[PDB]
Structure formats: structure tokens, C-alpha cells
Design an enzyme around this catalytic site. Structure first.
Site, PDB file in Angstrom:
ATOM      1  N   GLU A 106       0.816  -1.210   0.000  1.00  0.00           N
ATOM      2  CA  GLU A 106       0.000   0.000   0.000  1.00  0.00           C
ATOM      3  C   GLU A 106       0.853   1.263   0.000  1.00  0.00           C
ATOM      4  O   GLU A 106       0.542   2.226  -0.711  1.00  0.00           O
ATOM      5  CB  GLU A 106      -0.929   0.023   1.211  1.00  0.00           C
ATOM      6  CG  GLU A 106      -2.040  -1.023   1.188  1.00  0.00           C
ATOM      7  CD  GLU A 106      -3.083  -0.799   0.102  1.00  0.00           C
ATOM      8  OE1 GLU A 106      -2.999   0.193  -0.650  1.00  0.00           O
ATOM      9  OE2 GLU A 106      -3.983  -1.657  -0.018  1.00  0.00           O
ATOM     10  N   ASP A 147     -12.519   8.099  -8.133  1.00  0.00           N
ATOM     11  CA  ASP A 147     -13.782   8.685  -7.696  1.00  0.00           C
ATOM     12  C   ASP A 147     -13.607  10.021  -6.986  1.00  0.00           C
ATOM     13  O   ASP A 147     -14.604  10.595  -6.541  1.00  0.00           O
ATOM     14  CB  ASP A 147     -14.583   7.703  -6.822  1.00  0.00           C
ATOM     15  CG  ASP A 147     -13.903   7.397  -5.491  1.00  0.00           C
ATOM     16  OD1 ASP A 147     -12.810   7.937  -5.221  1.00  0.00           O
ATOM     17  OD2 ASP A 147     -14.472   6.627  -4.693  1.00  0.00           O
ATOM     18  N   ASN A 196      -9.027   5.170   3.010  1.00  0.00           N
ATOM     19  CA  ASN A 196      -9.754   5.967   2.022  1.00  0.00           C
ATOM     20  C   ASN A 196     -10.668   7.002   2.680  1.00  0.00           C
ATOM     21  O   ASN A 196     -11.401   6.681   3.619  1.00  0.00           O
ATOM     22  CB  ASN A 196     -10.605   4.997   1.192  1.00  0.00           C
ATOM     23  CG  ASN A 196     -11.002   5.551  -0.160  1.00  0.00           C
ATOM     24  OD1 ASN A 196     -11.018   6.755  -0.365  1.00  0.00           O
ATOM     25  ND2 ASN A 196     -11.332   4.661  -1.092  1.00  0.00           N
ATOM     26  N   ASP A 203      -6.477   8.110  -0.617  1.00  0.00           N
ATOM     27  CA  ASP A 203      -5.994   7.115   0.338  1.00  0.00           C
ATOM     28  C   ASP A 203      -4.800   7.692   1.093  1.00  0.00           C
ATOM     29  O   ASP A 203      -3.913   8.308   0.489  1.00  0.00           O
ATOM     30  CB  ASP A 203      -5.524   5.848  -0.376  1.00  0.00           C
ATOM     31  CG  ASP A 203      -6.665   5.030  -0.967  1.00  0.00           C
ATOM     32  OD1 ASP A 203      -7.861   5.262  -0.657  1.00  0.00           O
ATOM     33  OD2 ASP A 203      -6.362   4.086  -1.727  1.00  0.00           O
ATOM     34  N   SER A 256     -11.931  10.460  -4.134  1.00  0.00           N
ATOM     35  CA  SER A 256     -11.417  10.229  -2.790  1.00  0.00           C
ATOM     36  C   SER A 256      -9.896  10.084  -2.825  1.00  0.00           C
ATOM     37  O   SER A 256      -9.273  10.004  -3.894  1.00  0.00           O
ATOM     38  CB  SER A 256     -12.059   8.989  -2.169  1.00  0.00           C
ATOM     39  OG  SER A 256     -11.705   7.808  -2.864  1.00  0.00           O
ATOM     40  N   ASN A 269      -7.819   8.562  -5.794  1.00  0.00           N
ATOM     41  CA  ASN A 269      -8.627   7.546  -6.454  1.00  0.00           C
ATOM     42  C   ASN A 269      -9.447   8.169  -7.579  1.00  0.00           C
ATOM     43  O   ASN A 269      -9.693   9.377  -7.607  1.00  0.00           O
ATOM     44  CB  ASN A 269      -9.560   6.879  -5.440  1.00  0.00           C
ATOM     45  CG  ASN A 269      -8.793   6.226  -4.308  1.00  0.00           C
ATOM     46  OD1 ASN A 269      -7.825   5.507  -4.547  1.00  0.00           O
ATOM     47  ND2 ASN A 269      -9.195   6.496  -3.069  1.00  0.00           N
TER      48      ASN A 269
END
Ligand SMILES: [Cl-]
Ligand SMILES: [Cl-]
Ligand code: NA
Ligand code: NA
Ligand code: NA
Ligand SMILES: [Ru+3]
Ligand SMILES: [Ru+3]
Length: 129
Positions: free
Chosen positions: A35, A48, A59, A52, A50, A46
Site C-alpha cells: 500500500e 472517484d 480511504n 488514500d 477520494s 482515487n
């Protein structure tokens, strides 16, 4: 902060992640490796809208507030910036809530794709724990 492999394993264990919800310590270290490469300051946007945050790439759509993710929730009740600290407490406490949500560690797509079903104990091998 960029943790060492065994250093992060030890911090995760001190914070109660080892075998949390049945996931051995190597699972958590493996997830953090893919990650964030063990970097607490990692952020990634991301598709969309959002973002992380942190060692476990938590998220803003559901888990933390960053002020710029419309229609999102803040189920860990924290600013997303708290997930970037050199102290992993906030990331660990939020990860405990995420992994308890129903799908276990499958919540982390990278864990499913790169750690699940592998020899995850290799990630803690040699560490003084
Ligand atoms: Cl393990
Ligand atoms: Cl992946
Ligand atoms: Na490594
Ligand atoms: Na949010
Ligand atoms: Na927001
Ligand atoms: Ru859910
Ligand atoms: Ru729930």
C-alpha cells in the site's frame, strides 16, 4: 516516516494488530508494504475523487475526513492527515474498524491481490518480536 520492515512489525504488534480479527502480523506488514512501501506520508488519489492516506492507504470515501470528498463519511472520526503521522496509532485504530466491517482484509485490494494466499510470514521472518 519510512519504517523498516521489522520496525513496523514491532509497532503493529505493540498496537495490537498481530492476529487482530485472525490476521497474523505478516498479513499487516505485507499490506503496508504494497500500500505505502512503509511510508506513513503516502497519499494517492482515487478515480472517484477520494484519497488514500498513510501506511495502510485508508480511504476518505468512508473512513476519514479530508474536506474534499463529497458525500463521504468519516467512520474513524479522524482527519485524514492524522493517518500520515510518524505515530501509527491512528492508522492502526482505524484499520481495526475497517477489518471488522465484514470483508476482513479484502477491504485492501492490494492485500487481496498481492498478500492473500502467499507466505506472509516471510514479512516478519528474522524480526525480534
Ligand atoms: Cl505472519
Ligand atoms: Cl493490487
Ligand atoms: Na521490505
Ligand atoms: Na470522508
Ligand atoms: Na469531504
Ligand atoms: Ru460496510
Ligand atoms: Ru459496518
Amino acid at each position: 516516516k519510512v519504517f523498516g520492515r521489522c520496525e513496523l512489525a514491532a509497532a503493529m504488534k505493540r498496537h495490537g494488530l498481530d492476529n487482530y480479527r485472525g490476521y497474523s502480523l505478516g498479513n499487516w506488514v505485507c499490506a503496508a508494504k504494497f500500500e505505502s512501501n512503509f511510508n506513513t506520508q503516502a497519499t494517492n488519489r482515487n478515480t472517484d475523487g477520494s484519497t488514500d492516506y498513510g501506511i495502510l492507504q485508508i480511504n476518505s470515501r468512508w473512513w476519514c475526513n479530508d474536506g474534499r470528498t463529497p458525500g463521504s463519511r468519516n467512520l474513524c472520526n479522524i482527519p485524514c492527515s492524522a493517518l500520515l503521522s510518524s505515530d501509527i496509532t491512528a492508522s492502526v485504530n482505524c484499520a481495526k474498524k475497517i477489518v471488522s466491517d465484514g470483508n476482513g482484509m479484502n477491504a485492501w485490494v492490494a492485500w487481496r491481490n498481492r498478500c492473500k494466499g502467499t507466505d506472509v510470514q516471510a514479512w516478519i521472518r528474522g524480526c525480534r518480536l
